Amino acid sequence: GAMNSSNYAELFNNDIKLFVDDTNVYRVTVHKTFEGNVATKAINGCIFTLNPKTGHLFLKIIHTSVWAGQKRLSQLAKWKTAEEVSALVRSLPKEEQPKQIIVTRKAMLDPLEVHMLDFPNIAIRPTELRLPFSAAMSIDKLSDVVMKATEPQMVLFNIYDDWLDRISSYTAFSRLTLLLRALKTNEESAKMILLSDPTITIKSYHLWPSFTDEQWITIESQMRDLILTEYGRKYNVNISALTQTEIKDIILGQN
């Protein structure tokens, strides 16, 4: 069945599950040449495959060469996504194999079901949840590795850095989704917030800066304010006249 706000809690039990988002697999740039010709140029993309309990992100980099000689790349991208998720599953010992794969887009259901036919006890599930994983390319570290790739590459990240040392998976996933929603809403403002003051540093191998628990609470409050402010501007709405419940609803992005 579909994952929704009602059965969301299940994400934080011990059953291994993977989110798969295909939004950034096939990406293009458009630029006008001097001659006036519009060149549509494929750029390196990625499959966002995330374990929300552990933070493990299997970032399969889709190098532009995969599109070589192929037609109707938007359809092909869905199948190449399912192919690579399948390969990943097959690479894992049965212990580490997911019990569920949750696709963020409904169009990914069929290609993944077909690829995973031989895995009878891996549930392929759609979601009614609105999730901001398309904003993964707003995270500089991820965007940089994708662009630098000269060939198909699998890169393993922890999207929670070292947070699980201090906080639960639910708190970590809540922080992650708030950050991505902010980045998606106003990328420039969110990045200004994360850069913080001159005392804050980011580890060379982390995605996010090194904040204290108290600092993270403040950063998260700024992220909530960024989203509300945009909402406020967009709809000419007095965000100070909103109840705490109304504000929480907006922040969680489920419409």
PDB file of C-alpha atoms in Angstrom:
ATOM      1  CA  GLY A   1       0.000   0.000   0.000  1.00  0.00           C
ATOM      2  CA  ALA A   2       0.920   3.668  -0.348  1.00  0.00           C
ATOM      3  CA  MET A   3       2.947   5.338   2.373  1.00  0.00           C
ATOM      4  CA  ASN A   4       1.110   8.380   3.674  1.00  0.00           C
ATOM      5  CA  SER A   5       1.015  10.666   6.734  1.00  0.00           C
ATOM      6  CA  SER A   6      -0.938   7.967   8.623  1.00  0.00           C
ATOM      7  CA  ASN A   7       1.653   5.154   8.374  1.00  0.00           C
ATOM      8  CA  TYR A   8       4.718   7.457   8.239  1.00  0.00           C
ATOM      9  CA  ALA A   9       5.936   6.330  11.679  1.00  0.00           C
ATOM     10  CA  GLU A  10       6.861   2.887  10.254  1.00  0.00           C
ATOM     11  CA  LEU A  11       9.887   4.583   8.610  1.00  0.00           C
ATOM     12  CA  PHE A  12      11.595   4.612  12.010  1.00  0.00           C
ATOM     13  CA  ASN A  13      11.356   0.945  13.005  1.00  0.00           C
ATOM     14  CA  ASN A  14      14.038  -1.691  12.314  1.00  0.00           C
ATOM     15  CA  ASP A  15      12.779  -2.912   8.913  1.00  0.00           C
ATOM     16  CA  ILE A  16      15.260  -1.773   6.253  1.00  0.00           C
ATOM     17  CA  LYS A  17      13.584   0.519   3.709  1.00  0.00           C
ATOM     18  CA  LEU A  18      14.900   2.692   0.857  1.00  0.00           C
ATOM     19  CA  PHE A  19      13.446   5.854  -0.650  1.00  0.00           C
ATOM     20  CA  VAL A  20      14.183   6.213  -4.368  1.00  0.00           C
ATOM     21  CA  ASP A  21      13.833   9.562  -6.089  1.00  0.00           C
ATOM     22  CA  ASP A  22      14.506   9.782  -9.858  1.00  0.00           C
ATOM     23  CA  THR A  23      13.920  13.546 -10.298  1.00  0.00           C
ATOM     24  CA  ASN A  24      17.610  14.345 -10.924  1.00  0.00           C
ATOM     25  CA  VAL A  25      18.534  11.365 -13.153  1.00  0.00           C
ATOM     26  CA  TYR A  26      18.066  13.016 -16.545  1.00  0.00           C
ATOM     27  CA  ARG A  27      19.080  16.669 -16.412  1.00  0.00           C
ATOM     28  CA  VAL A  28      19.659  19.261 -19.106  1.00  0.00           C
ATOM     29  CA  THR A  29      20.941  22.799 -19.531  1.00  0.00           C
ATOM     30  CA  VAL A  30      19.655  25.143 -22.228  1.00  0.00           C
ATOM     31  CA  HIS A  31      21.879  27.861 -23.658  1.00  0.00           C
ATOM     32  CA  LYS A  32      21.606  30.100 -26.704  1.00  0.00           C
ATOM     33  CA  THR A  33      24.649  30.142 -28.964  1.00  0.00           C
ATOM     34  CA  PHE A  34      25.737  33.384 -30.665  1.00  0.00           C
ATOM     35  CA  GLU A  35      24.159  32.110 -33.892  1.00  0.00           C
ATOM     36  CA  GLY A  36      20.798  32.006 -32.088  1.00  0.00           C
ATOM     37  CA  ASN A  37      20.645  28.221 -31.916  1.00  0.00           C
ATOM     38  CA  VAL A  38      19.351  26.809 -28.658  1.00  0.00           C
ATOM     39  CA  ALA A  39      21.572  23.955 -27.550  1.00  0.00           C
ATOM     40  CA  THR A  40      20.019  21.507 -25.105  1.00  0.00           C
ATOM     41  CA  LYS A  41      22.888  19.899 -23.217  1.00  0.00           C
ATOM     42  CA  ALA A  42      22.675  16.838 -20.977  1.00  0.00           C
ATOM     43  CA  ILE A  43      24.506  17.181 -17.660  1.00  0.00           C
ATOM     44  CA  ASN A  44      25.446  14.517 -15.118  1.00  0.00           C
ATOM     45  CA  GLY A  45      22.528  13.398 -12.970  1.00  0.00           C
ATOM     46  CA  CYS A  46      21.960  11.077 -10.030  1.00  0.00           C
ATOM     47  CA  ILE A  47      19.640   8.558  -8.402  1.00  0.00           C
ATOM     48  CA  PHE A  48      18.807   9.520  -4.824  1.00  0.00           C
ATOM     49  CA  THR A  49      18.505   6.215  -2.927  1.00  0.00           C
ATOM     50  CA  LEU A  50      18.179   6.853   0.807  1.00  0.00           C
ATOM     51  CA  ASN A  51      17.816   4.764   3.938  1.00  0.00           C
ATOM     52  CA  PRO A  52      15.985   7.206   6.251  1.00  0.00           C
ATOM     53  CA  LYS A  53      16.775   5.202   9.415  1.00  0.00           C
ATOM     54  CA  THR A  54      20.568   5.091   8.924  1.00  0.00           C
ATOM     55  CA  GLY A  55      21.062   8.153   6.679  1.00  0.00           C
ATOM     56  CA  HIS A  56      22.945   6.007   4.142  1.00  0.00           C
ATOM     57  CA  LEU A  57      22.652   7.620   0.725  1.00  0.00           C
ATOM     58  CA  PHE A  58      23.640   5.450  -2.209  1.00  0.00           C
ATOM     59  CA  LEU A  59      24.189   8.194  -4.745  1.00  0.00           C
ATOM     60  CA  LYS A  60      24.471   6.507  -8.129  1.00  0.00           C
ATOM     61  CA  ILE A  61      25.911   9.146 -10.453  1.00  0.00           C
ATOM     62  CA  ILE A  62      24.385   9.042 -13.936  1.00  0.00           C
ATOM     63  CA  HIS A  63      27.134  10.173 -16.318  1.00  0.00           C
ATOM     64  CA  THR A  64      25.963  11.779 -19.589  1.00  0.00           C
ATOM     65  CA  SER A  65      27.461   8.830 -21.553  1.00  0.00           C
ATOM     66  CA  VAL A  66      24.586   6.547 -20.431  1.00  0.00           C
ATOM     67  CA  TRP A  67      22.315   8.506 -22.816  1.00  0.00           C
ATOM     68  CA  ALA A  68      24.714   7.794 -25.720  1.00  0.00           C
ATOM     69  CA  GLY A  69      22.814   6.891 -28.884  1.00  0.00           C
ATOM     70  CA  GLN A  70      19.481   6.625 -27.095  1.00  0.00           C
ATOM     71  CA  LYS A  71      16.044   8.074 -27.863  1.00  0.00           C
ATOM     72  CA  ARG A  72      13.249   9.391 -25.604  1.00  0.00           C
ATOM     73  CA  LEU A  73      15.572   9.821 -22.640  1.00  0.00           C
ATOM     74  CA  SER A  74      12.797  10.773 -20.170  1.00  0.00           C
ATOM     75  CA  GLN A  75      11.253   7.305 -20.466  1.00  0.00           C
ATOM     76  CA  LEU A  76      14.633   5.554 -20.546  1.00  0.00           C
ATOM     77  CA  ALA A  77      15.690   7.383 -17.340  1.00  0.00           C
ATOM     78  CA  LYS A  78      12.942   5.628 -15.344  1.00  0.00           C
ATOM     79  CA  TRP A  79      14.171   2.213 -16.457  1.00  0.00           C
ATOM     80  CA  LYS A  80      17.842   3.059 -15.913  1.00  0.00           C
ATOM     81  CA  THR A  81      16.823   4.122 -12.374  1.00  0.00           C
ATOM     82  CA  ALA A  82      15.083   0.816 -11.715  1.00  0.00           C
ATOM     83  CA  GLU A  83      18.057  -1.046 -13.238  1.00  0.00           C
ATOM     84  CA  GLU A  84      20.541   0.621 -10.882  1.00  0.00           C
ATOM     85  CA  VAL A  85      18.361   0.191  -7.781  1.00  0.00           C
ATOM     86  CA  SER A  86      18.091  -3.504  -8.711  1.00  0.00           C
ATOM     87  CA  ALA A  87      21.884  -3.783  -9.118  1.00  0.00           C
ATOM     88  CA  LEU A  88      22.329  -2.153  -5.686  1.00  0.00           C
ATOM     89  CA  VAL A  89      19.901  -4.584  -4.022  1.00  0.00           C
ATOM     90  CA  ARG A  90      21.792  -7.490  -5.676  1.00  0.00           C
ATOM     91  CA  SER A  91      25.121  -6.160  -4.348  1.00  0.00           C
ATOM     92  CA  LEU A  92      23.878  -6.222  -0.733  1.00  0.00           C
ATOM     93  CA  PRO A  93      23.984  -9.340   1.483  1.00  0.00           C
ATOM     94  CA  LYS A  94      20.406 -10.561   2.108  1.00  0.00           C
ATOM     95  CA  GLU A  95      20.735  -9.191   5.661  1.00  0.00           C
ATOM     96  CA  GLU A  96      21.129  -5.635   4.403  1.00  0.00           C
ATOM     97  CA  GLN A  97      18.534  -5.994   1.620  1.00  0.00           C
ATOM     98  CA  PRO A  98      15.491  -3.731   1.994  1.00  0.00           C
ATOM     99  CA  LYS A  99      12.092  -5.079   2.995  1.00  0.00           C
ATOM    100  CA  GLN A 100      10.493  -2.116   1.206  1.00  0.00           C
ATOM    101  CA  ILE A 101      11.427   0.276  -1.598  1.00  0.00           C
ATOM    102  CA  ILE A 102       9.389   3.483  -1.602  1.00  0.00           C
ATOM    103  CA  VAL A 103       9.318   5.492  -4.811  1.00  0.00           C
ATOM    104  CA  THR A 104       8.740   9.253  -4.554  1.00  0.00           C
ATOM    105  CA  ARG A 105       7.147   9.341  -8.018  1.00  0.00           C
ATOM    106  CA  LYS A 106       4.288   7.085  -9.160  1.00  0.00           C
ATOM    107  CA  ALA A 107       5.828   6.638 -12.636  1.00  0.00           C
ATOM    108  CA  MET A 108       8.710   4.729 -10.968  1.00  0.00           C
ATOM    109  CA  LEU A 109       6.370   1.978  -9.704  1.00  0.00           C
ATOM    110  CA  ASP A 110       6.076  -0.108 -12.864  1.00  0.00           C
ATOM    111  CA  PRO A 111       9.730   0.018 -13.995  1.00  0.00           C
ATOM    112  CA  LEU A 112      10.825  -0.943 -10.464  1.00  0.00           C
ATOM    113  CA  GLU A 113       8.178  -3.666 -10.050  1.00  0.00           C
ATOM    114  CA  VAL A 114       9.316  -5.268 -13.331  1.00  0.00           C
ATOM    115  CA  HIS A 115      13.024  -5.083 -12.387  1.00  0.00           C
ATOM    116  CA  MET A 116      12.341  -6.533  -8.920  1.00  0.00           C
ATOM    117  CA  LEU A 117      10.013  -9.359  -9.983  1.00  0.00           C
ATOM    118  CA  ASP A 118      12.592 -11.923  -8.790  1.00  0.00           C
ATOM    119  CA  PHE A 119      12.560 -10.359  -5.294  1.00  0.00           C
ATOM    120  CA  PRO A 120       9.098 -11.515  -4.112  1.00  0.00           C
ATOM    121  CA  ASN A 121       9.444 -10.219  -0.520  1.00  0.00           C
ATOM    122  CA  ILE A 122      10.614  -6.711  -1.348  1.00  0.00           C
ATOM    123  CA  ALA A 123       7.552  -4.470  -1.355  1.00  0.00           C
ATOM    124  CA  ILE A 124       7.644  -1.718  -3.977  1.00  0.00           C
ATOM    125  CA  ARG A 125       5.461   1.059  -2.542  1.00  0.00           C
ATOM    126  CA  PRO A 126       4.362   4.442  -3.845  1.00  0.00           C
ATOM    127  CA  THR A 127       3.918   7.494  -1.548  1.00  0.00           C
ATOM    128  CA  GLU A 128       1.303  10.202  -1.109  1.00  0.00           C
ATOM    129  CA  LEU A 129       3.882  12.174   0.922  1.00  0.00           C
ATOM    130  CA  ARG A 130       5.262  15.349  -0.587  1.00  0.00           C
ATOM    131  CA  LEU A 131       9.031  15.063  -0.173  1.00  0.00           C
ATOM    132  CA  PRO A 132      11.804  17.529  -1.167  1.00  0.00           C
ATOM    133  CA  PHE A 133      14.491  15.073  -2.410  1.00  0.00           C
ATOM    134  CA  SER A 134      14.587  16.852  -5.811  1.00  0.00           C
ATOM    135  CA  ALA A 135      16.538  19.566  -3.939  1.00  0.00           C
ATOM    136  CA  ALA A 136      19.494  17.182  -3.349  1.00  0.00           C
ATOM    137  CA  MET A 137      21.379  19.112  -6.049  1.00  0.00           C
ATOM    138  CA  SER A 138      21.146  22.252  -3.864  1.00  0.00           C
ATOM    139  CA  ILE A 139      23.531  20.548  -1.421  1.00  0.00           C
ATOM    140  CA  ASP A 140      26.947  21.728  -2.674  1.00  0.00           C
ATOM    141  CA  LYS A 141      28.864  18.567  -1.763  1.00  0.00           C
ATOM    142  CA  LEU A 142      26.403  16.389  -3.703  1.00  0.00           C
ATOM    143  CA  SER A 143      26.177  18.757  -6.683  1.00  0.00           C
ATOM    144  CA  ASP A 144      29.978  18.914  -6.907  1.00  0.00           C
ATOM    145  CA  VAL A 145      30.573  15.143  -6.894  1.00  0.00           C
ATOM    146  CA  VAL A 146      27.862  14.696  -9.551  1.00  0.00           C
ATOM    147  CA  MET A 147      29.360  17.365 -11.856  1.00  0.00           C
ATOM    148  CA  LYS A 148      32.994  16.199 -11.398  1.00  0.00           C
ATOM    149  CA  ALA A 149      32.192  12.561 -12.355  1.00  0.00           C
ATOM    150  CA  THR A 150      33.863  11.493 -15.609  1.00  0.00           C
ATOM    151  CA  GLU A 151      32.120   8.097 -15.637  1.00  0.00           C
ATOM    152  CA  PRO A 152      29.276   6.129 -13.989  1.00  0.00           C
ATOM    153  CA  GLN A 153      30.033   6.169 -10.239  1.00  0.00           C
ATOM    154  CA  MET A 154      28.483   4.885  -7.030  1.00  0.00           C
ATOM    155  CA  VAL A 155      29.184   7.221  -4.090  1.00  0.00           C
ATOM    156  CA  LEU A 156      28.043   6.409  -0.559  1.00  0.00           C
ATOM    157  CA  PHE A 157      27.219   9.334   1.734  1.00  0.00           C
ATOM    158  CA  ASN A 158      25.630   9.705   5.127  1.00  0.00           C
ATOM    159  CA  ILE A 159      23.103  12.470   4.549  1.00  0.00           C
ATOM    160  CA  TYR A 160      22.845  12.943   8.342  1.00  0.00           C
ATOM    161  CA  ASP A 161      26.621  13.389   8.714  1.00  0.00           C
ATOM    162  CA  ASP A 162      27.252  12.324  12.354  1.00  0.00           C
ATOM    163  CA  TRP A 163      23.882  13.475  13.823  1.00  0.00           C
ATOM    164  CA  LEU A 164      22.733   9.972  14.843  1.00  0.00           C
ATOM    165  CA  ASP A 165      25.456  10.116  17.514  1.00  0.00           C
ATOM    166  CA  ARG A 166      23.229  12.679  19.248  1.00  0.00           C
ATOM    167  CA  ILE A 167      19.678  12.440  17.880  1.00  0.00           C
ATOM    168  CA  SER A 168      17.106   9.862  16.751  1.00  0.00           C
ATOM    169  CA  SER A 169      16.401   8.938  13.135  1.00  0.00           C
ATOM    170  CA  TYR A 170      13.037  10.708  13.322  1.00  0.00           C
ATOM    171  CA  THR A 171      14.720  13.959  14.449  1.00  0.00           C
ATOM    172  CA  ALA A 172      17.439  13.495  11.806  1.00  0.00           C
ATOM    173  CA  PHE A 173      14.885  12.841   9.034  1.00  0.00           C
ATOM    174  CA  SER A 174      12.809  15.836  10.213  1.00  0.00           C
ATOM    175  CA  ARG A 175      15.909  18.097  10.119  1.00  0.00           C
ATOM    176  CA  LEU A 176      16.859  16.777   6.648  1.00  0.00           C
ATOM    177  CA  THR A 177      13.425  17.350   5.130  1.00  0.00           C
ATOM    178  CA  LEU A 178      13.183  20.849   6.665  1.00  0.00           C
ATOM    179  CA  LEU A 179      16.611  21.746   5.242  1.00  0.00           C
ATOM    180  CA  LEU A 180      15.758  20.441   1.747  1.00  0.00           C
ATOM    181  CA  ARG A 181      12.361  22.174   1.753  1.00  0.00           C
ATOM    182  CA  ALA A 182      14.070  25.449   2.695  1.00  0.00           C
ATOM    183  CA  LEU A 183      16.731  24.946  -0.012  1.00  0.00           C
ATOM    184  CA  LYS A 184      13.991  24.146  -2.527  1.00  0.00           C
ATOM    185  CA  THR A 185      12.022  27.286  -1.488  1.00  0.00           C
ATOM    186  CA  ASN A 186      14.835  29.852  -1.371  1.00  0.00           C
ATOM    187  CA  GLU A 187      18.235  28.273  -2.011  1.00  0.00           C
ATOM    188  CA  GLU A 188      20.239  31.464  -1.554  1.00  0.00           C
ATOM    189  CA  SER A 189      18.628  32.341   1.823  1.00  0.00           C
ATOM    190  CA  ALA A 190      18.987  28.793   3.200  1.00  0.00           C
ATOM    191  CA  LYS A 191      22.683  28.739   2.311  1.00  0.00           C
ATOM    192  CA  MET A 192      23.203  32.122   4.015  1.00  0.00           C
ATOM    193  CA  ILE A 193      21.622  30.602   7.151  1.00  0.00           C
ATOM    194  CA  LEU A 194      23.893  27.514   7.070  1.00  0.00           C
ATOM    195  CA  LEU A 195      27.050  29.541   6.582  1.00  0.00           C
ATOM    196  CA  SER A 196      26.089  31.143   9.923  1.00  0.00           C
ATOM    197  CA  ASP A 197      28.777  33.193  11.686  1.00  0.00           C
ATOM    198  CA  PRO A 198      32.605  33.082  11.305  1.00  0.00           C
ATOM    199  CA  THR A 199      32.999  30.488  14.122  1.00  0.00           C
ATOM    200  CA  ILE A 200      31.068  27.748  12.323  1.00  0.00           C
ATOM    201  CA  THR A 201      32.944  25.134  10.277  1.00  0.00           C
ATOM    202  CA  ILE A 202      32.042  22.259   7.955  1.00  0.00           C
ATOM    203  CA  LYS A 203      34.082  19.037   7.940  1.00  0.00           C
ATOM    204  CA  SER A 204      35.634  18.245   4.534  1.00  0.00           C
ATOM    205  CA  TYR A 205      33.551  15.054   4.315  1.00  0.00           C
ATOM    206  CA  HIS A 206      30.286  16.362   5.805  1.00  0.00           C
ATOM    207  CA  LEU A 207      27.316  17.742   3.863  1.00  0.00           C
ATOM    208  CA  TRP A 208      26.228  20.121   6.656  1.00  0.00           C
ATOM    209  CA  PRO A 209      28.044  22.444   9.120  1.00  0.00           C
ATOM    210  CA  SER A 210      29.113  21.336  12.609  1.00  0.00           C
ATOM    211  CA  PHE A 211      26.403  22.772  14.889  1.00  0.00           C
ATOM    212  CA  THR A 212      25.886  22.238  18.618  1.00  0.00           C
ATOM    213  CA  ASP A 213      22.458  20.867  19.659  1.00  0.00           C
ATOM    214  CA  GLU A 214      21.384  24.419  20.680  1.00  0.00           C
ATOM    215  CA  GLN A 215      22.720  25.876  17.419  1.00  0.00           C
ATOM    216  CA  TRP A 216      20.795  23.271  15.383  1.00  0.00           C
ATOM    217  CA  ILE A 217      17.561  24.329  17.123  1.00  0.00           C
ATOM    218  CA  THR A 218      18.216  27.953  16.074  1.00  0.00           C
ATOM    219  CA  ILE A 219      19.206  26.941  12.524  1.00  0.00           C
ATOM    220  CA  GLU A 220      16.009  24.902  12.283  1.00  0.00           C
ATOM    221  CA  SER A 221      14.005  27.931  13.491  1.00  0.00           C
ATOM    222  CA  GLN A 222      15.584  30.038  10.731  1.00  0.00           C
ATOM    223  CA  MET A 223      14.686  27.361   8.166  1.00  0.00           C
ATOM    224  CA  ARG A 224      11.051  27.376   9.376  1.00  0.00           C
ATOM    225  CA  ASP A 225      11.017  31.203   9.217  1.00  0.00           C
ATOM    226  CA  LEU A 226      12.454  31.134   5.654  1.00  0.00           C
ATOM    227  CA  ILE A 227       9.655  28.846   4.485  1.00  0.00           C
ATOM    228  CA  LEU A 228       6.927  30.838   6.305  1.00  0.00           C
ATOM    229  CA  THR A 229       8.243  34.156   5.010  1.00  0.00           C
ATOM    230  CA  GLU A 230       8.107  32.897   1.421  1.00  0.00           C
ATOM    231  CA  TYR A 231       4.612  31.508   2.048  1.00  0.00           C
ATOM    232  CA  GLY A 232       3.726  34.916   3.539  1.00  0.00           C
ATOM    233  CA  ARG A 233       5.095  36.838   0.566  1.00  0.00           C
ATOM    234  CA  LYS A 234       3.575  34.427  -1.976  1.00  0.00           C
ATOM    235  CA  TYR A 235      -0.006  34.578  -0.690  1.00  0.00           C
ATOM    236  CA  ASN A 236       0.002  38.031   0.965  1.00  0.00           C
ATOM    237  CA  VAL A 237      -0.535  36.400   4.328  1.00  0.00           C
ATOM    238  CA  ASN A 238       0.153  37.801   7.802  1.00  0.00           C
ATOM    239  CA  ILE A 239       2.288  34.950   9.186  1.00  0.00           C
ATOM    240  CA  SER A 240       2.130  36.579  12.644  1.00  0.00           C
ATOM    241  CA  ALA A 241      -1.661  36.083  12.554  1.00  0.00           C
ATOM    242  CA  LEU A 242      -1.250  32.339  11.964  1.00  0.00           C
ATOM    243  CA  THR A 243      -1.765  29.817  14.775  1.00  0.00           C
ATOM    244  CA  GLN A 244       1.101  27.491  15.775  1.00  0.00           C
ATOM    245  CA  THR A 245      -0.869  24.605  14.215  1.00  0.00           C
ATOM    246  CA  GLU A 246      -1.260  26.462  10.892  1.00  0.00           C
ATOM    247  CA  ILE A 247       2.474  27.287  10.872  1.00  0.00           C
ATOM    248  CA  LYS A 248       3.462  23.635  11.539  1.00  0.00           C
ATOM    249  CA  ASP A 249       1.221  22.545   8.610  1.00  0.00           C
ATOM    250  CA  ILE A 250       2.944  24.949   6.194  1.00  0.00           C
ATOM    251  CA  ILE A 251       6.415  23.865   7.401  1.00  0.00           C
ATOM    252  CA  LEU A 252       5.645  20.149   6.889  1.00  0.00           C
ATOM    253  CA  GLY A 253       4.721  20.857   3.225  1.00  0.00           C
ATOM    254  CA  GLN A 254       1.842  18.375   2.734  1.00  0.00           C
ATOM    255  CA  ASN A 255      -0.386  21.105   1.174  1.00  0.00           C
TER     256      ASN A 255
END
